Design a protein around this ligand. Structure first.
Ligand SMILES: Cc1cn([C@H]2C[C@H](O)[C@@H](COP(=O)(O)OP(=O)(O)OP(=O)(O)O)O2)c(=O)[nH]c1=O
Ligand SMILES: Cc1cn([C@H]2C[C@H](O)[C@@H](COP(=O)(O)OP(=O)(O)OP(=O)(O)O)O2)c(=O)[nH]c1=O
Ligand SMILES: Cc1cn([C@H]2C[C@H](O)[C@@H](COP(=O)(O)OP(=O)(O)OP(=O)(O)O)O2)c(=O)[nH]c1=O
Ligand SMILES: [Mg+2]
Ligand SMILES: [Mg+2]
Ligand SMILES: [Mg+2]
Lengths: 189, 189, 189
């Protein structure tokens, strides 16, 4: 059960769903278009021998912000982390999906959102996994529409929503593209 | 709320959901398998210095149609745009997802559908974002099953469905893999 | 309509949804975290000239199992098939999605799940399509959390669920990352 434009608007006007800033001209038949922030993480480390999800490696990426008025250039075959300009606050009874946009995929710009869902209870900017699969670099402009948020009704309110100690959540409140915290509570056999 | 095979069939027999041509043998437990068209766009431009989503660049891709009876060869590490053989027409109260198929991913053929959803009100062929992540070229045969359409019920009918001036839709009615129109209404900060 | 943690737990305690082994500490606001098996398929064939989805090519991949206590190393720009440690059994009235996890995408580990949905009626381990889009190899540990299962309610029970002869299903009961069976019932124009 995916929220139509009208119901998305109702969740926003009722204050159940926070989107800051909210621009109503971005609402779409079945989603709301979202915008790109000015914060990027590039994989440009030159000391580590490998990535180990069980280990903390905060230096794996560098935080990069382009000069005001300039794009970040995503190179062919490159993957970076970006972030939404908007801060989202979800209630305990909706879950979102942060998808890409067809216009952007037609240019070879892919938003992966590998994890699929934004969890009930989540509040923060959303970290975007961005790939360029074209043969040419792509100028990414801070502020451009980069994807769309779709909301699904939960069957019932989540018992221990994102942010709760019991969920063990890692990214509640994030203001940028937080480096991975997979090493926390990491398990292996 | 995802439509079962029976309910998909009901939406089709009632005329609420158009799929042209419709082959009932393609309906699946929870989706309908879809087929590949004979139209492909390759990234083979040799004049542009880069991609700028704010700019119109219709020559970024070339339209390629294989000789009747022959496959299009998707090379390792290559991304192209393809298209569904079927033309889909959605009502204002369903949204679809055009996913890949597990058999094809097991060979390294990935349908990205980065944008996720086919919008309430959308009518046209669906443009497929296709990658080969194997070590070998893959022969793509026009007419083969290439993915599957899953339908979700909307919470309520969409107020301004895809195709409406208010939605500002770019691809209503597309018969092939339309080049990107991201430059239209493009915004940036 | 996506199942909350509580409703996921109800489907499990009622015996409608099988997850073997089930670890309740893995349930999340809107999904259940899943774990990686010790079975991997690498694309390391050196005889075939190309991939043809219409043809049987069982030797396209090699099955690889790391030494107990050691990781499988996924190299930059590499795609392999992995598998869930858990065996899932779905009823005829739910469909699942096997997504990645944000912690893992922040390291450049992408679970594609190109096909999106686990079908009503499906029973088996789930085959994971894994890419490394970082600049560094990633040690994948058997037993680590690798993704999350989200469940959606179907509109109604599926008439011919996965596994039925009428659905023509290829992978019912799979215990590992089964090589592709796209050649079965393969169609082309
Ligand atoms: C997901 C997807 C959608 N589509 C179609 C169906 C969607 O309803 C339509 C628009 O998808 P959108 O993701 O909304 O594309 P867009 O926002 O960049 O462009 P627009 O202004 O037109 O909204 O494109 C494809 O052709 N291929 C795809 O992979
Ligand atoms: C999405 C996905 C599904 N599966 C399982 C669960 C699905 O119900 C089952 C079939 O997925 P499908 O995408 O329907 O695969 P298929 O159409 O190519 O093959 P089939 O004829 O059997 O339908 O495979 C995986 O193992 N890995 C995955 O990533
Ligand atoms: C899908 C996605 C989620 N998120 C946010 C919203 C999710 O509710 C939150 C967690 O996503 P998860 O996929 O649940 O991440 P995780 O399991 O690795 O970490 P955690 O222990 O915190 O659950 O991250 C992004 O920032 N970017 C994304 O692409
Ligand atoms: Mg749109
Ligand atoms: Mg199938
Ligand atoms: Mg999580």
């Amino acid at each position: 059960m995916l929220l139509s434009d009208r119901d998305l608007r109702a969740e926003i006007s009722s204050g159940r769903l926070g989107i800051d800033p909210f621009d109503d001209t971005l609402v779409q038949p079945s989603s709301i278009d979202v915008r790109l922030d000015c914060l990027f993480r590039v994989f440009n480390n030159t000391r580590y021998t490998h990535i180990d999800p069980a280990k903390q490696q905060d230096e794996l990426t560098s935080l990069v912000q382009p000069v005001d008025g300039e794009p970040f250039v995503l190179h062919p075959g490159e993957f970076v982390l970006g972030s939404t300009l908007e801060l989202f606050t979800l209630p305990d009874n909706l879950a979102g999906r942060l998808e890409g946009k067809s216009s952007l995929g037609r240019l070879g710009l892919l938003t992966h959102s590998t994890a699929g869902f934004i969890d009930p209870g989540f509040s923060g900017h959303i970290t975007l996994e961005l790939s360029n699969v074209a043969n040419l670099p792509i100028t990414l402009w801070p502020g451009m529409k980069i994807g769309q948020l779709c909301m699904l009704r939960l069957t019932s309110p989540s018992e221990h929503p994102y942010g709760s100690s019991r969920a063990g959540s890692k990214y509640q409140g994030q203001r940028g593209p937080t480096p991975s915290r997979s090493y926390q509570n990491f398990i292996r056999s």
